[model samples]
Target: NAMASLHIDDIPAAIKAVKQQLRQALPDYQQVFQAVEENIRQQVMEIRRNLAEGKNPVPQLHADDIINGKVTEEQKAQIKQRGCCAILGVFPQEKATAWNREIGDYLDRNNFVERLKNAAEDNYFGTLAASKPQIYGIYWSTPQVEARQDKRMQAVQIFLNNLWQTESNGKQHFDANRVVTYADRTRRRPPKSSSLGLSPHVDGGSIERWLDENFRHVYRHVFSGQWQKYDPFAAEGRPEVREFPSPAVCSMFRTFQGWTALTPQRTHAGTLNVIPIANAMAYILLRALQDDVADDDLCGAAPGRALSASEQWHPLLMEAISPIPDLEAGDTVFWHCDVIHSVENEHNGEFDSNVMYIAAAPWCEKNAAYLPRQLASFIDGRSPPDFAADDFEVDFIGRATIKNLTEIGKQQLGIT
Candidate 1:
């Protein structure tokens, strides 16, 4: 079932071939695009109206609702439509704030900032306006270990995983009830941080979506011009995807990309903004095939970079762009992997904003396959396999070790 990945030199030809294949199945792509456009327009208008009327289109649910199975069908339907939500109170404010303070002390005690000044900057965060110190490369800190292995965090992860249809075509794509740690860094941006924020994009894999066979299979319905039949939550063919990894590309299938708030984040403070439509991927793919776009281009998507969503190409989706409401410390936010999201241009708030990147990478053949190498990286204190080789925590004064694992954490690491 292994398919050869494309070389950078072959991208133009691959794009052409994919376009031809799509045209064969969808001779009336323009007509279909028009329908998609109208649908997007209607959704965008509704979102804008809600925003104007002071409504938060993003749904919010308490942790108790999830753990007790009290989330209503209506709420689930809204989550599926918007493709994002905030799970309130995943950790208590007192504990989250303590974790936040400890992360600072851990970095300060290790002279992390001094070392970073002498070393090459990780290119992933270098694109932004330089902060005094915002994103850290450390992964195995005590606070991160505590959060990742917490029973409450595991409950949140499983709830998100269950949103997908895990079984398809008689094959189970993943164990929705279980998750593996996909080690990632944390952010601690100071108040009034003057910087150019991130742009709208999706992060799984950019051009590979059109070139890789197994990746392409995940979007088969859209390619076949039956996009109306496309189910964004269906897990079929997802376990088979093999992305060409880079610092920017993830090697595992994350059900919902997420982050846990360590400090209050409010609107207009450089917080996350999303298009909030689950099936926006279909539009981006079909838009690239239009006559106006370059034959060799898939709407500014480049290999090893994120899939771009912009004002020029995704104007209507841009109309619906909305930020999540105010979040207190301990709240967690999750969005579908394909949703278009970006950061506001600047942080205008009075308090510092901070969060830890943690997502739901449920146990599956694809995810489990990466665990051995990831565990090795964890044991060695190197950066996780998908990230840049910063490895800043390897010899730090207080990096978490095997002894830090709870019974659940040991099981998560497959050590039990």
Candidate 2:
């Protein structure tokens, strides 16, 4: 409500209120979690020791498994137990490899590198840069649009969405099978160039989870002294919640955030690293409520940025996470929404490590409503509402137009 802008800024009062609410919600977390986390940490330390090895712990699958809707019961068990997985060959290798080449050509055609180079000298908020961009701000590229609209991509989404339970009615709500396009950016890391973004942080919002009523409601089981009963498998009431405007905040809900590799992305060469601990969100959230971390001082967590984790506040998470192993073009990587993720710091090997970000966005009111604005932005070549003020193509030539959108694309974009 326009009437309560001040409430959003009253951080201290909000923290106090949330603290009291959580006081009733949580039990003796320090005692309950200490024993389990000790074991978890031991394993995590061992996992990190082996990150440079070929015996990857994160699960991998084939595209046929998704197309046939068949995750070997063992594979399903593995991915569900862990929070992330990889699927090889969702798109054809040649086609995806070409997209990487085309992205470079598209950047060259638009003089994007030079323009981005000039802009990045001093980004006030300090997230994007053309000088050493791991993530390109350009959102409406033809390859991205075409891939998002592809039948195979659409099929992949349905397969992922089905992994959740639709009938689990505990006030957490959303349809699991329906889906929407969670528009995102693509990246091409230059070989041996330091990455622009490489830190241990979780996406979604930073402060809102602690302060927002809906998020609290969504995690009611965890905070309300029944942490073991809390389940993240359902789509849940997150998207329909009151707005918590922040950078890196997706306008809709995603069951799984994912990317399609555009090249043979090696593990250490500027690819992804994740904690593989989505289930441990129960532990992390409960752990924060302990007196050491306060809502008001949640690692200087204010709005408009990704939620950060570090040795200071979340040392357990830091010690436990590992990078997803190597992959080829056309492979897909998926992680649960709450999974803590990061980009690898260096491109130590040959070839450009690249991927196009696309998440398993399920259809819901919040997502469906956001589509018109996304469509409008795509038409004007403006940044969609989710990204921070990207207007790179306001008057630029060769921006993707409706001619590139197919029937499925129009339908997903809500034009049909």
Candidate 3:
């Protein structure tokens, strides 16, 4: 109905068409549905039981282990099972603190705060002085560049990429050993920063995952009733756009979504939260097909936004979503590409909560194609392709440039 207001004209037909295709594509949906129902029950039972007990099963690894290459197989299993993990101490606490202060000065040096005077009111932080800006729209600051190109950060990325696997057929999938840079924005939420409330949701695509032919391949296993065989990593290497003509909205092919913390945060305060359900991406998709959802509607999902799940549509699983706990400066928190994650609504803490967004864009043929464009934008010091345009950084001073990058950094940017 809302989309109809825009006169898209064929949304209902599109929804109905996809519905029929799903039915034809997977005649065994009833069986798959039953299995998913059981999984949701058992999964929810465990999730609820665990969260009620105040147990946070999200894995954490020490940075020293990554540095010494001492990460164990058992630890790897734990991380893959949880679908997300935090690397403690990728950079020293002092380094993170210094970087935090440096960004503040960089913004001031270039008049970032004042530059926003003419910009429209932004939600978390910005011209809306009722609250401090939560997420800084800037992407190419020096600290962010150094962090993405950092050796320790690269190690963490490599480890995450490896968690995604290649099958025994010798058919190569994602290469865990190499990482590419995905330039992203930063977050600096001061104490009592107004909550930009988010509910349970997945990023990437909403209805287009079902409507787009390219994305259909990504979920083929799920739609084919072979979801148990559907490895989330199977969706990687596809360079298709998952969108309704929105570029920045769809980040397909990223194996992991991550952030490097610049300030200390705990579960008690507003922090990034994840449902220990990245391993259940298959189940998440199937749930939308259940009769519980509205006709011609994906709960509240649309083409550009992520598929949002609610208790009304996925009751057993809603309360089961858990909060990820304590984080320190320089710790990178990464979740699988399909992980359903959100931030705590309110930050009831004393200090500011801050982080820099990063992702595990391991070297792949597909990501390579994005490199030149990304590198060009990096040199231009503007928000990259997957972010909104008109960010106006081309005139800014103190932003990182190609000359500031190390050799590995250059390679990571696809400049080589």
Best by lDDT: 1
> Which scores higher on lDDT, 2 or 3?
3
Q: Which candidate tops TM-score?
A: 1
lDDT of 3 by residue, 134-218 (tens): 7777988889989988988888888777777643446565566878888888888776666775687777777767767677777
**Using TM-score as the measure, what is the rank order of every candidate, best first?**
1, 3, 2
Which residue pairs collide, candidate 2? 25-223, 179-363, 247-304
lDDT to native, each model: 0.84, 0.74, 0.75
lDDT of 1 at 126: 51
**Where does candidate 3 stray beyond 4 Å?**
1-8, 28-31, 121-131, 167-170, 235-242
lDDT of 3: 0.75
* Residue 290 Cα positional deviation in candidate 2, in Å, after optimal superposition: 2.0
| lDDT (Cα) of model 2 | 0.74
Please write out the lDDT profile of model 1 over residues 155-194, one tens digit for every residue. 9899988999998888888899998888888987777876
lDDT of 2 by residue, 1-416 (tens): 22125355676777677676766655566665675466557657666666657567678888887788777778776676667888788889999989888877888888886777666646554434445566788888778888888888888777767777645565435555556776788888878888668477767666667677777677777666665566667556666455455455577878888989998978668788888765656666666666776645655565666677677767877877677867889888998887788887878878878889988887777778899999888888888887867678766666678899888888878886
Q: Could you tell me the lDDT of residue 333 within candidate 1?
A: 93
Angstrom error at residue 287, model 2: 1.7
